[PDB]
Symmetry: C2
Subunit: 49 residues, 2 copies
């Protein structure tokens, strides 16, 4: 009967390991080129006659 197959693999390469860079909630902020501040937003205003 169908049994789970598991191929054999070589040792892990360090170049394959990116995960240590995003594992904590904080690392998710750390990983952004720039964060959202309030002085970045521009609110459109429609002024009537």
């Amino acid at each position: 009967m169908h049994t789970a197959e598991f191929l054999e693999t070589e040792p892990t390469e360090i170049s394959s390991v990116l995960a240590g860079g995003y594992n904590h909630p904080l690392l998710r902020q750390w990983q952004s080129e720039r964060q959202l501040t309030k002085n970045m937003l521009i609110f459109p205003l429609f002024i009537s006659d």
Copy 2:
């Protein structure tokens, strides 16, 4: 007697005009590649025996 000399010049070139990019306090934040947030700081701690 010594009088203030003023050479004559040609019209201003637009490529020389950068000043409209930093004149307001807000434009000074606008001009930064990235702003300082609190989750960016890392405080060193020296723990004793």
